[PDB]
Write a protein that binds this ligand. Sequence first.
Ligand SMILES: *[C@@H]1O[C@H](CO)[C@@H](O[C@@H]2O[C@H](CO)[C@@H](O[C@@H]3O[C@H](CO)[C@@H](O)[C@H](O)[C@@H]3O)[C@H](O)[C@H]2NC(C)=O)[C@H](O)[C@H]1NC(C)=O
Ligand SMILES: *[C@@H]1O[C@H](CO)[C@@H](O[C@@H]2O[C@H](CO)[C@@H](O[C@@H]3O[C@H](CO)[C@@H](O)[C@H](O)[C@@H]3O)[C@H](O)[C@H]2NC(C)=O)[C@H](O)[C@H]1NC(C)=O
Ligand SMILES: *[C@@H]1O[C@H](CO)[C@@H](O[C@@H]2O[C@H](CO)[C@@H](O[C@@H]3O[C@H](CO)[C@@H](O)[C@H](O)[C@@H]3O)[C@H](O)[C@H]2NC(C)=O)[C@H](O)[C@H]1NC(C)=O
Ligand SMILES: *[C@@H]1O[C@H](CO)[C@@H](O[C@@H]2O[C@H](CO)[C@@H](O)[C@H](O)[C@H]2NC(C)=O)[C@H](O)[C@H]1NC(C)=O
Ligand SMILES: *[C@@H]1O[C@H](CO)[C@@H](O[C@@H]2O[C@H](CO)[C@@H](O)[C@H](O)[C@H]2NC(C)=O)[C@H](O)[C@H]1NC(C)=O
Ligand SMILES: *[C@@H]1O[C@H](CO)[C@@H](O)[C@H](O)[C@H]1NC(C)=O
Ligand SMILES: [Cl-]
Ligand SMILES: [Zn+2]
Lengths: 596, 193
Amino acid sequence: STIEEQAKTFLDKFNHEAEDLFYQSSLASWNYNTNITEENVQNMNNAGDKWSAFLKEQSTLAQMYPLQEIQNLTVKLQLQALQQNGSSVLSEDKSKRLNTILNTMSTIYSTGKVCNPDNPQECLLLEPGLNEIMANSLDYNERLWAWESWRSEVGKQLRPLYEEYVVLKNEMARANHYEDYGDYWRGDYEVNGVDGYDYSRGQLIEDVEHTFEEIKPLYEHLHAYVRAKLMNAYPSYISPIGCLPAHLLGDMWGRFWTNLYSLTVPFGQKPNIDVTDAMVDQAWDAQRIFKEAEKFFVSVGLPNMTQGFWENSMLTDPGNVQKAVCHPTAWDLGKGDFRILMCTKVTMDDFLTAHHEMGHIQYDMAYAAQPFLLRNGANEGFHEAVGEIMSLSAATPKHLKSIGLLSPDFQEDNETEINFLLKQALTIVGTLPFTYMLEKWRWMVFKGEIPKDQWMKKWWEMKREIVGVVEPVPHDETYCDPASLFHVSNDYSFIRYYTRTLYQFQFQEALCQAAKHEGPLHKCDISNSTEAGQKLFNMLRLGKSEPWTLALENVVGAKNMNVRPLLNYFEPLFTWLKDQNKNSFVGWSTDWSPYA
Amino acid sequence: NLCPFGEVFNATKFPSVYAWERKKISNCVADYSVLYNSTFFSTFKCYGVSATKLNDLCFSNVYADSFVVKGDDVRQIAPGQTGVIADYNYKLPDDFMGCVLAWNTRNIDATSTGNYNYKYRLFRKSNLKPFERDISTEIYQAGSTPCNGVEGFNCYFPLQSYGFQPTNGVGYQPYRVVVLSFELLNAPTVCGP
Ligand SMILES: *[C@@H]1O[C@H](CO)[C@@H](O[C@@H]2O[C@H](CO)[C@@H](O[C@@H]3O[C@H](CO)[C@@H](O)[C@H](O)[C@@H]3O)[C@H](O)[C@H]2NC(C)=O)[C@H](O)[C@H]1NC(C)=O
Ligand SMILES: *[C@@H]1O[C@H](CO)[C@@H](O[C@@H]2O[C@H](CO)[C@@H](O[C@@H]3O[C@H](CO)[C@@H](O)[C@H](O)[C@@H]3O)[C@H](O)[C@H]2NC(C)=O)[C@H](O)[C@H]1NC(C)=O
Ligand SMILES: *[C@@H]1O[C@H](CO)[C@@H](O[C@@H]2O[C@H](CO)[C@@H](O[C@@H]3O[C@H](CO)[C@@H](O)[C@H](O)[C@@H]3O)[C@H](O)[C@H]2NC(C)=O)[C@H](O)[C@H]1NC(C)=O
Ligand SMILES: *[C@@H]1O[C@H](CO)[C@@H](O[C@@H]2O[C@H](CO)[C@@H](O)[C@H](O)[C@H]2NC(C)=O)[C@H](O)[C@H]1NC(C)=O
Ligand SMILES: *[C@@H]1O[C@H](CO)[C@@H](O[C@@H]2O[C@H](CO)[C@@H](O)[C@H](O)[C@H]2NC(C)=O)[C@H](O)[C@H]1NC(C)=O
Ligand SMILES: *[C@@H]1O[C@H](CO)[C@@H](O)[C@H](O)[C@H]1NC(C)=O
Ligand SMILES: [Cl-]
Ligand SMILES: [Zn+2]
């Protein structure tokens, strides 16, 4: 027998053995996430350990097939995926310690509480207390207290754990023939073997920086506008030429400036397109929300949701007797089992996020016929990009009117368009420098370019210079403010959000051109377009069988990420900001601080 | 003396596809309306002869093969398919003259814990000839190293069980299948007005 044929038969056996084990693990973890009990957590951990043991056995087995002798790209990809030594290349004690510190960081992040000094009986954890403050408070001192308490409490605990985390993860990545853990993470985008579609792990850094350079002017003008508007809100606290104080950005970190809309609305005279009251007055429920999303997806040529989906999903909070995890998730359990876990409220935000999660589910349904190890997005950004184009189409006023949640006599001024685009930008473009700077800091730390004695020094230097954000109080090396974010303290890569943000507007442009759309791109609703549906399905069905560059080319015509779709989406707001900032300073000095 | 098609259709236990079961049907009247006036079946596809005009036809004898397959594999019970079921478990001839019938049996063939009785053959050297049947449980040798009856590296047990549970998608839910083939000889037996 040939080495390739032996590997093919091994992969057949693996797929058929792994479907059932992954399904059992998924059932156990679902029973946990929908019904948090000790029996359920023990069953989840049992099934997960069984799956991990099977995976490590199959890894050591697949390593016995010499990769160099494989001439079939698909079986080569599957073999490499199985051969990843992962954490196993660690000694037993070091692996135990790494899992220990991972769980410890996750625990202190998800459980940390800070108490009010003025009223020591009131104590809040991050959700919902401190986030409610950072979202709605207009008091400078209260916001500063929340920000500094969160950091000086949980990040100080996280600091040494994160140092040990860095050293252990670097040991693992180096033992797995990578430069560092950042190189490992960037490996998700690597394509190696297909002529004309390859992609190295440093090409990602090159491309991200080259595109952020072009993003810079739009962000600078949005920053200047928001800075002036915040000066009206916090007089004597903000310099007209300085960076924005980090605790006034709308959430705990400034990842999204969404909650600054009340303070930055261009034309507050216009009514806001918040259809929450319409949904409540029409007696909508989560059933109706998800049925409407399903009708949307069917209107473009995609299948219904499965009866198994409608029978097994949990779309509302089960109440006080049965406590569950409410983070919205789209579950692809395998064996054709698709579910959504979401504690849906009757709000416009939950309507849009239901569209997003059902887009996730549609992707999963579309690549179900692929072999097991190929049932996944082209890269880490594709699922969120698909969900986001769904949510954009659902958020357009044309769609909102056609569904009947917005009045037919809602006039679309040239000012309502700037309002809508500004609110979109606060979220979408406000997050890009944040994401890029966080991942740059993480990459540099993993690379060993930032010594431990100036972690926070370089963190806030980069904050100032890149993001235009300045800390309200000085922080020494005791703090670990990057780890005060969920993705950092829970070992999730972050550049996925940048890449998906660019991908989503590439996709929106392509699918709206397919839908013969004519007006400004942000006014595009791909509803009722079987052509756009087909063009998107041609990419969804591939899963991870083809390179992500080829998958992106199949829909948008380009082998790489592009920023002009995003810039063209935001062009009208860009010119409006350039006019609005004629007598305002654009840019920022990196040296001014709210303290001296 | 009517032919007991009910014995194979309304049967309590159904066999695994790798060990599909064949029942001969000789001289008897055969009402086929008992089959065609019914929406119970999910497929009900006929080949080589009209699906409903069988009543006025007479055959030398009729063979009823029965088994159980996953919903997505029913597509393979037809002439000229090339999947795992069609190649290693149950192959139909290119000149097949008969009818395939299948119906969803999640309620009886799936349990919450998981029904792993129904199996199928995953590995075999050479395909099956039409209507052939293999029950061998000998260790499949993939590589050049001999297996010596022990399962191991490049030595795979050839059978794999379906995992039938009520939360599986329709494509992974169990369907019971009866293939009715019609034999023709220059001999006389199965009419059925
Ligand atoms: C690398 O190896 C894979 C095998 O895993 C090759 O893909 C396989 O190609 C065969 C023949 O093209 C496919 O069989 C086809 O099945 C359909 C089912 O309806 C049938 O209609 C066709 O007549 C044919 O028999 C098989 O499905 C396919 N497997 C997968 C998973 O796609 C692949 O072509 C090899 N790569 C290269 C570059 O040769
Ligand atoms: C494109 O997709 C939209 C999204 O649903 C579809 O629009 C809506 O379709 C429904 C039924 O097809 C229309 O309902 C009817 O509304 C009239 C006017 O109030 C009412 O008197 C009738 O009793 C009925 O309920 C709804 O008006 C319509 N909305 C709009 C804005 O057109 C539309 O059908 C799709 N177009 C296609 C598929 O060509
Ligand atoms: C397996 O068992 C079911 C019932 O347990 C059988 O279905 C039954 O078939 C009979 C006769 O085909 C049906 O009775 C009546 O027949 C007269 C004949 O004139 C007809 O006019 C009536 O409309 C009705 O069909 C009976 O209703 C039907 N019952 C059910 C629940 O479908 C079935 O035939 C058995 N399988 C085999 C292969 O025999
Ligand atoms: C939530 O989880 C529990 C177990 O973690 C489920 O089962 C309950 O507890 C034992 C477990 O066998 C049974 O004897 C009880 O009868 C079950 N019910 C209750 C009320 O205790 C429980 O069914 C799960 N909840 C739901 C809605 O499925
Ligand atoms: C998706 O499902 C809907 C209903 O769930 C299907 O709508 C059918 O519409 C008319 C009446 O509303 C009838 O043909 C049926 O009663 C409806 N179906 C059902 C299951 O009740 C719709 O056809 C489905 N579309 C796709 C593509 O599957
Ligand atoms: C995985 O680890 C083993 C040591 O247990 C080593 O021999 C093997 O080469 C490693 N695999 C890779 C791809 O480096
Ligand atoms: Cl921070
Ligand atoms: Zn998600």
